[PDB]
Structure 1
Amino acid sequence: IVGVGMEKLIISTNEHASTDQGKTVSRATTNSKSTAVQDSNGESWNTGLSINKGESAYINANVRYYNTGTAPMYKVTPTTNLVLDGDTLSTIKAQENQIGNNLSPGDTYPKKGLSPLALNTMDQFSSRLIPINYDQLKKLDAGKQIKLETTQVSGNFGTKNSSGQIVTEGNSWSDYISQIDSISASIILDTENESYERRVTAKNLQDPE
């Protein structure tokens, strides 16, 4: 049973700023019909500020994964929602930068004592950042918060042969989730410092077989 918790979120405003300054020197001469000489000089300063309405800022979320089940998950690949007010800004599946190799029951990735990992890219090859609008940025500036919802998690399990050779590649937990949830009852014990979630098989009394 794997879930994701967001610890803090960072805004990266996307603005372009400029600054100029110049100097000029001139000279003039007039001969009417009378002569004259004019000497001139000056300077200037400028500033600028350009902003894009399509992508006014970028966001970055620090997250952790936890396991409250009975079995480890290998190659943890969760999918998360980012919700601001009533809008799901984006849904990101974890890239190869945000994949946890091991997650034992009762453990955490990154392990306790380490900083949270940063989820700041949305494309497949981790080369594109997560944008937001001008209106969404204004909503954030007014004090509204972004929530993180986990919708699913992908992971592997290990199968052992007679010589103790563990293989996880190609063994997917998603193939068994529906079948386990269909024939089981869920029990949760909450305590105070740790939580446990279990599934226990239940009998169908309408089937004689």
Structure 2
Amino acid sequence: IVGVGMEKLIISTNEHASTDQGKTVSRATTNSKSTAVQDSNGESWNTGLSINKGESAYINANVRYYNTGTAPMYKVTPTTNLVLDGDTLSTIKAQENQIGNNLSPGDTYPKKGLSPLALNTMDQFSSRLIPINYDQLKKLDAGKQIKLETTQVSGNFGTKNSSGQIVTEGNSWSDYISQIDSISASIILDTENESYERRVTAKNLQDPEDKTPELTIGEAIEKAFGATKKDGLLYFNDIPIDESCVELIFDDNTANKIKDSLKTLSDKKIYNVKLERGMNILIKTPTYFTNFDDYNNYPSTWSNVNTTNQDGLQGSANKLNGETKIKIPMSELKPYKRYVFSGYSKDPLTSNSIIVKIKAKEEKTDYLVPEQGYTKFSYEFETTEKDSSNIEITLIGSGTTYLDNLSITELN
């Protein structure tokens, strides 16, 4: 999975400015019928400027290639789009100057610690720069930006023979993109400072001749991301990626399919749903999360803690008649980003609702009525300038209610 990210853009205006300076000496005489003598001298200066409306300026872009798949790509030749407002200025296929020989998974071309490469030419033989129009130049000078979109990437793969001779010529990756994408379900894991994109084969139910094995979502996740099991829970390296401990974001079709297939399922767990073709699953590991059993990474400390019972999702409730409090030092938060606070609450015996207050950019209050089963609430907030007041949150509520798996995540 290869993408292109632009780092900065350079505008080169194309004008022809010149200057002049002269000097003239004259002499004249007259003979009336009385004589006259005339002298003259002086200096002159001139300035000029010429601008071509058709091709007013040129643009240069610095880019970085990154890979997040499971296989390397040799001879990376990506194609990029340049958009100003709704106008695609040009599409440039990478020339010989901008082809990466090797791009291993998790790596980057150019390697981390090196300057980005410059894509400033459009023709096949790297001889004609990228032009713009005068109106587009005025739009650029007005503060508008240029976005870079990647549409396709061409590369080769390696085949090893018996005696060990890698050959990467004629082994295009484009012969397998359509076939692989049409029989597989895509799963994405978005950890901090890292991202993984995977494809897992899914069985077809209408074809009696499809002998490929059947997988559930949990098994597919474990196979794809190399997760390990401790006590029935999935761990990536040390981060728990259990259903209750992360954020699952689907598209409309996958959400509808999961909802429809959850009715006939006994366990009523998303990880037990059968994986089907075309599914799109995204997992976002939380920024801060604790389960009151063995995990905690919050900068502060919970005000009220009572985890001396076998309750909650797994042996942890942390709730008495008093209300809890969190102080956010704001020292580890994005200056401009929207966050989500989520958790599970169960009300065994009917009581009053729970009132939540969050102050990060705006003061918001909501009332939730917990049920006999734990239910996610997932309220939202947002930072302002990284130099604002500490975020304080209350979970006002009585009636010996319960809590578990309270987490904070970010969104893109």
TM-score by length of 1: 0.99
- Measure how far apart 1:13 and its partner are: 0.2
In structure 2, stretches of 5+ residues that fail to align are 209-411
- Measure how far apart 1:82 and its partner are: 0.3
Distance 1:163 1:101 in 2: 23
Q: Report the 3-state secondary structure (helix = DSSP H, G, I; strand = E; otherwise coil) of the residue aligned with 1:207.
A: coil
Q: Report the 3-state secondary structure (helix = DSSP H, G, I; strand = E; otherwise coil) of the residue aligned with 2:191.
A: coil
Deviations 1:86-107 (A, max 9, x none): 1000000000000000000000
Higher strand share: 1
Name 1:102's counterpart in structure 2. Answer: 102
Greater relative contact order (Cα < 8 A, sep 6+): 1
Distance 2:54 2:177 in 1: 39
Name 1:25's counterpart in structure 2. Answer: 25
Deviations 1:39-59 (A, max 9, x none): 100110000000000000000
Q: Report the 3-state secondary structure (helix = DSSP H, G, I; strand = E; otherwise coil) of the residue aligned with 1:19.
A: strand
Name 1:89's counterpart in structure 2. Answer: 89
Deviations 1:167-198 (A, max 9, x none): 00100000000000000000000011100000
Answer yes or no: is 1:55 the counterpart of 2:55. Answer: yes
- Measure how far apart 1:161 and its partner are: 0.5
Distance 2:97 2:164 in 1: 30
Distance 2:39 2:173 in 1: 84
In structure 1, stretches of 5+ residues that fail to align are none
Percent sequence identity is 100
Name 1:167's counterpart in structure 2. Answer: 167
Q: Report the 3-state secondary structure (helix = DSSP H, G, I; strand = E; otherwise coil) of the residue aligned with 1:137.
A: helix
Question: RMSD between aligned alpha carbons?
Answer: 2.9
- Measure how far apart 1:120 and its partner are: 0.2
- Measure how far apart 1:148 and its partner are: 0.1
Which aligned segments of 4 or more residues in structure 1 are displaced greater than 3 angstroms?
Answer: none
Distance 2:129 2:82 in 1: 14
Q: Figure out how many residues of one structure are paired with residues of the other and give that number.
A: 209
- Measure how far apart 1:149 and its partner are: 0.1
- 1:75-86 equivalence runs, <5 A: 75-86=75-86
Deviations 1:120-152 (A, max 9, x none): 000000000000000000000000000000000
TM-score by length of 2: 0.50
Q: Report the 3-state secondary structure (helix = DSSP H, G, I; strand = E; otherwise coil) of the residue aligned with 2:24.
A: strand
- Measure how far apart 1:163 and its partner are: 0.8
- Measure how far apart 1:207 and its partner are: 0.3
Distance 2:178 2:156 in 1: 15
